[PDB]
């Protein structure tokens, strides 16, 4: 826990949440995006027209070039670099210092965003996903081994300008309300979880719970968007399409292409349905819920205007931004397990509330993960 990290983050909707790091001696500022969803730290160290500044290797009496190439390949897009290492900061995180690896970004392809206000990711997942190889060792490793730093950090992403809170090295119970509800960690490379049953509105969409994680399930900060594989997303379409019915709207809008109006504070929230995921608990046959409200899926861009937050996928479904931001996100790597729980800036609905609920029963919840 700690109080000086608690609204260390900002964002503009769509954009992704950052925190503030410095790297470099003297101190580098710069913004960096926290990715649940890689494993690399990289920061711009050239010029590019979306950069308002970047990381001069030149200028810090502490870098160590690596004499390493290196390149990133995300769903989104992709930089190249040069790896070295270098003294990095959280100015609103812990009190420490730690030389760590950095990819210093040479050459970037539909990476940075115009405007955005950051100009480097943090990767905060596990080694094995990490380029070029494992033996890069990632940040947040890199934190725990050279400082006393628990093997922990939570995350508290708040909807909207927005912003939220990282709390690295532990928990901040000012931050959630109720009980915190942990799915283990299939296995330590994305940060990997098994959704064992889904429901939308209360009816359960009745497919082999293998389909939910066709591929795998990764909860994924660095992902704006709930991302379900083809059958999964078809499915959820079509029930979230019945139950707004009402109105009809165009394909390019449950595509993600165009956005939907509606006159200034008349949108119709309670045509559209609430989703459920069951995750995998701690103990046998036992599960819990996150739910999930329609002014999570339903992000906004005169009139109120959204985009439908919910895309299909062919590398297994990702429990994006959109998802983390109605709950408080433990990452408890020490245990291998995450936690969820009702975040302190949670969603609002006048008849509906997103929730964390359990216990469930839930037999052969093994059989749910793909092989
Ligand atoms: C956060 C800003 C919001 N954006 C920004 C662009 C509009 C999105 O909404 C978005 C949409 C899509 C999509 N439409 O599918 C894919 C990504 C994406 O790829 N994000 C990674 C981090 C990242 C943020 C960034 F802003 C730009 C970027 F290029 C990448 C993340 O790490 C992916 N983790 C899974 C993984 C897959 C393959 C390879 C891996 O290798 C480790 C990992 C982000």
């Known amino acids: 826990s700690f109080v000086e990290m608690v609204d260390n983050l900002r964002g503009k909707s769509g954009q992704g949440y950052y925190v503030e790091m410095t790297v470099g001696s003297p101190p580098q500022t710069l913004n ?3 990715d649940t969803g890689s494993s690399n730290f990289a920061v711009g160290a050239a010029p590019h027209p979306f950069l308002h500044r970047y990381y001069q290797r030149q200028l810090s009496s502490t870098y160590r070039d690596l ?55 943090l990767g905060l997942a596990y080694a094995e996903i990490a380029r070029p190889d494992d033996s890069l060792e990632p940040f947040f490793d890199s934190l725990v081994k050279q400082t006393h730093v ?61 389909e939910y994680n066709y591929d795998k399930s990764i909860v994924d900060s660095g992902t704006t968007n709930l991302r379900l594989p083809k059958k999964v997303f078809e499915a959820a379409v079509k029930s979230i399409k019945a139950a707004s019915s009402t109105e009809k709207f165009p394909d390019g809008f449950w595509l993600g292409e165009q956005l939907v109006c509606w006159q200034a504070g008349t949108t119709p929230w309670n045509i559209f349905p609430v989703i459920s995921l069951y995750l995998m608990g701690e103990v ?37 931004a959109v998802i983390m931001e109605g709950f408080y996100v433990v990452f408890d790597r020490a245990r291998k397990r995450i936690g969820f729980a009702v975040s302190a800036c949670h969603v609002h609905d006048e008849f509906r509330t997103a929730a964390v609920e359990g216990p469930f029963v839930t037999l052969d919840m093994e059989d749910c993960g793909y092989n």
């Open 32 to 34: 960096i995006l926290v």
């Open 67 to 121: 004499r390493k190439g290196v390149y990133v390949p995300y769903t989104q897009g992709k930089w190249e670099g040069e790896l070295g290492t270098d003294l990095v900061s959280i100015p609103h995180g812990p009190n420490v210092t730690v030389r760590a690896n950095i990819a210093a970004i040479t050459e970037s392809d539909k990476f940075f965003i115009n405007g955005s206000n950051w100009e480097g990711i």
């Open 150 to 210: 628990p093997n922990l950090f939570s995350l508290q992403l708040c909807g909207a300008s927005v912003g939220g809170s990282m709390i690295i090295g532990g928990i901040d119970h000012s931050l959630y309300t109720g009980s915190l509800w942990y799915t283990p960690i299939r296995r330590e490379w994305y940060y990997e979880v098994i959704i064992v049953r889904v429901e939308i509105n209360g009816q359960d969409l009745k497919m082999d719970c293998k």
């Open 284 to 320: 046998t046959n036992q599960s819990f819920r996150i739910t999930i409200l329609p002014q999570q899926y339903l992000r906004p861009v005169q009139d109120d205007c959204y985009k439908f937050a919910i895309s299909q996928s062919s590398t297994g479904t990702v429990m994006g």
